[PDB]
Design an enzyme around this catalytic site. Sequence first.
Site, PDB file in Angstrom:
ATOM      1  N   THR A 165       0.290   4.831   1.745  1.00 47.16           N
ATOM      2  CA  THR A 165      -0.477   5.519   2.763  1.00 47.16           C
ATOM      3  C   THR A 165      -0.680   6.984   2.442  1.00 47.16           C
ATOM      4  OG1 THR A 165       0.342   4.069   4.474  1.00 47.16           O
ATOM      5  CG2 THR A 165      -0.469   6.247   5.205  1.00 47.16           C
ATOM      6  N   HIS A 192       5.185   6.745  -1.197  1.00 42.20           N
ATOM      7  CA  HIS A 192       5.942   5.527  -1.396  1.00 42.20           C
ATOM      8  C   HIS A 192       5.138   4.268  -1.085  1.00 42.20           C
ATOM      9  CE1 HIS A 192       6.148   6.292   2.907  1.00 42.20           C
ATOM     10  NE2 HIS A 192       6.185   4.967   2.986  1.00 42.20           N
ATOM     11  N   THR A 239       6.086   0.736   0.870  1.00 45.59           N
ATOM     12  CA  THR A 239       7.147   0.109   1.617  1.00 45.59           C
ATOM     13  C   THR A 239       7.148  -1.348   1.269  1.00 45.59           C
ATOM     14  OG1 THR A 239       7.031   1.572   3.511  1.00 45.59           O
ATOM     15  CG2 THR A 239       7.942  -0.646   3.894  1.00 45.59           C
ATOM     16  N   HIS A 252       0.753  -1.235   0.000  1.00 47.39           N
ATOM     17  CA  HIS A 252       0.000   0.000   0.000  1.00 47.39           C
ATOM     18  C   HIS A 252       0.792   1.299   0.000  1.00 47.39           C
ATOM     19  CE1 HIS A 252       0.554  -0.939   4.376  1.00 47.39           C
ATOM     20  NE2 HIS A 252       0.705   0.374   4.464  1.00 47.39           N
TER      21      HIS A 252
END
EC number: 3.1.4.37
Length: 215
Positions: free
Chosen positions: A69, A146, A148, A67
């Site tokens: 965020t 981003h 992760t 994901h």
Amino acid sequence: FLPLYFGWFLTKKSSETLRKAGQVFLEELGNHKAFKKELRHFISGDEPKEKLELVSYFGKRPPGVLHCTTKFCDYGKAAGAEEYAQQEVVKRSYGKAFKLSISALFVTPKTAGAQVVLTDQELQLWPSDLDKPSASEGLPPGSRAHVTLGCAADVQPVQTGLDLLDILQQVKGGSQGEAVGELPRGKLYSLGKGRWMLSLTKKMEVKAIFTGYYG
């Protein structure tokens, strides 16, 4: 009522596609000794010699499908959470599909991720009260966006966005290298201090749903 956080969660296909690309990049850093030696040195310095699998080292990763965020809400407790969630753009976007452009992959001694370059439409969902604004000072809004892919055992995956910014700050200065070389999907840069960025010749578009996550 409010989720732990809001974000764009990748579909099954796209999540596996990005996962694999991350893996391969870690294996390239790990398969070539110029590269591994330098990353291993800013990870463990002069600690007792020890074997290191980068894919294992970066084994920890936030729960849920991959994901990007937007706003951490902590069920209403975090600052700015109700104001974020009340937005018509947020209400409207919930459950809808988006495509995220991945422009680069990056690794540091703390984290492994993919840089997201948000569209103008996706930026309307990007919050304006993020922590450490000095860290993205002079960079366009949405810079730390981003996904992760992994982080080291004692690192909070929030670190990934600060690591990205730091890389983008250095590359705005020009303390980027000329590329150390070419890898299959693009130019590889050694930024120093164990930080590596692969700039993709072509951006990866990954499909995702904007929604909320509960713990």
